[PDB]
């Protein structure tokens, strides 16, 4: 039980940590993709202007 207790607590902490990491990284990837797309639209504007 005590062994099971420690196993359970450690696994739960590890799981919550991984979840928080992946969620925040998902937010980051969203932000960087927004950067990319908005920059692409700037690229299109510039292309039209130059042509």
């Amino acid at each position: 039980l005590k062994d099971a207790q420690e196993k359970l607590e450690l696994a739960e902490k590890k799981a919550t940590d991984a979840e928080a990491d992946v969620a925040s990284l998902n937010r980051r990837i969203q932000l960087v993709e927004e950067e990319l797309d908005r920059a692409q639209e700037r690229l299109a504007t510039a292309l039209q202007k130059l042509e």
């Binding site: 992946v22 969620a23 998902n26 797309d37």
Partner: protein, 371 residues
């Protein structure tokens, strides 16, 4: 005071106080009377186990969902489910809390009117408001445009929205959902020898579907691969032993979403009803809808669906538009998170259907300005 954001759904009732991140209590919506005789005296045997209690005694019960396809077919059982949700899973009397139910689009009026009549007469809430299940899922994504495909367990509906102005003529509601996939999986498992018939074993087949099935990126290649190698056969242990091995039933069960001809339905898959829903919109907001396609609902949690759907739409759509599919990790509770956000708004605080208003106009108030 705080508002109660209930969300009836069909398959899992999700509820909790407004302003949090996740629903407080999530439990299946099944009410199962016992079916055998019962010989022990004084065991304290009740006449109906509802909610998560009937998923533990399901061996001697006959579980029956009170909500078939969005609509409610058995009002007494639904009242029992609501009573359980309020009193035992949240332990807050409804006399002191506003409620925010959710309803699928294009549902019968009588269902909504009966829902509001129950909430005002039996539970006697101060004020309740009914909202369309897709607008909330759009709230949760933090967007204000986009076309949301909310493939629940009862019914799959596809509501496009632009700049906050919903397009009522472009809602495409299809009645294929998780329950039909469970039935089809239970029907194709018989090709290996495993027969599940009892209404209790439908839960076991549902667990198999959740844990093993996945959506194939390309269907024919997977069918060819699973028929030559054996790298796909994943095994699963029943509630009593006797492990089973699922072969190419893994990606054939959720493939029904993209080819509803498997279960005999005529209509086109969820990959083509989205494109049709877009094409009914005006010609100037199609780019934004293409770029902000939102997924929600439980059934859209299959591993590998956000790529298959994008590939299909990119095949259908013009080559210049960019197709992007928003698939947040919190897909299952997206509708409820959006409901919490909407109930927490100050601007929304005067849209509730106050009880005195219901007393003056009857249950038909819901179709009126207070939508």
């Amino acid at each position: 005071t705080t508002a109660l954001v209930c969300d009836n759904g069909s398959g899992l009732v999700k509820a909790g106080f407004a302003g949090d991140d996740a629903p407080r209590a999530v439990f299946p919506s099944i009410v199962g009377r016992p079916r055998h005789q019962g010989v022990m005296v004084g065991m304290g045997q009740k006449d109906s186990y509802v909610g998560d209690e009937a998923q533990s005694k399901r061996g001697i019960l006959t579980l029956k969902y009170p909500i078939e396809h969005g609509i409610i077919t058995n009002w007494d059982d639904m009242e029992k489910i609501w009573h359980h949700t309020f009193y035992n899973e949240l332990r807050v009397a409804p006399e002191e809390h506003p409620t925010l139910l959710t309803e699928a689009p294009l549902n019968p009026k009588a269902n909504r009117e009966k829902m509001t009549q129950i909430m005002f007469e039996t539970f006697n809430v101060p004020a309740m408001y009914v909202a369309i299940q897709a607008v909330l899922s759009l709230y949760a994504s933090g967007r204000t445009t986009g076309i949301v495909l909310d493939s629940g367990d009862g019914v799959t509906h596809n509501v496009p929205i632009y700049e906050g102005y919903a397009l009522p003529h472009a809602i495409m509601r299809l009645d294929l959902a998780g329950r039909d996939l469970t039935d089809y999986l239970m029907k194709i498992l018989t090709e290996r020898g495993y027969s599940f018939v009892t209404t209790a074993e439908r839960e076991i087949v549902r667990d198999i579907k959740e844990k093993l099935c996945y959506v194939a990126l390309d269907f024919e290649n997977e069918m060819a691969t699973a028929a030559s190698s054996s790298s796909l056969e994943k095994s699963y242990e029943l509630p009593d032993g006797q492990v089973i091995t699922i072969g190419n039933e893994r990606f054939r069960c959720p493939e029904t979403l993209f080819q509803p001809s498997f279960i005999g339905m005529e209509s086109a898959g969820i990959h083509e009803t989205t494109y049709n829903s877009i094409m009914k919109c005006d010609i100037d907001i199609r780019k934004d809808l293409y770029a902000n396609n939102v997924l929600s609902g439980g059934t859209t949690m299959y591993p590998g669906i956000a790529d298959r759907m994008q590939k299909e739409i990119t095949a259908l759509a013009p080559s210049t538009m960019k197709i992007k599919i928003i698939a947040p990790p919190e897909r299952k509770y997206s509708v409820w998170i959006g409901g919490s956000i909407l109930a927490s708004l100050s601007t929304f605080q005067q849209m509730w259907i106050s009880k005195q208003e219901y007393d003056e106009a009857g249950p038909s108030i819901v179709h009126r300005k207070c939508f």
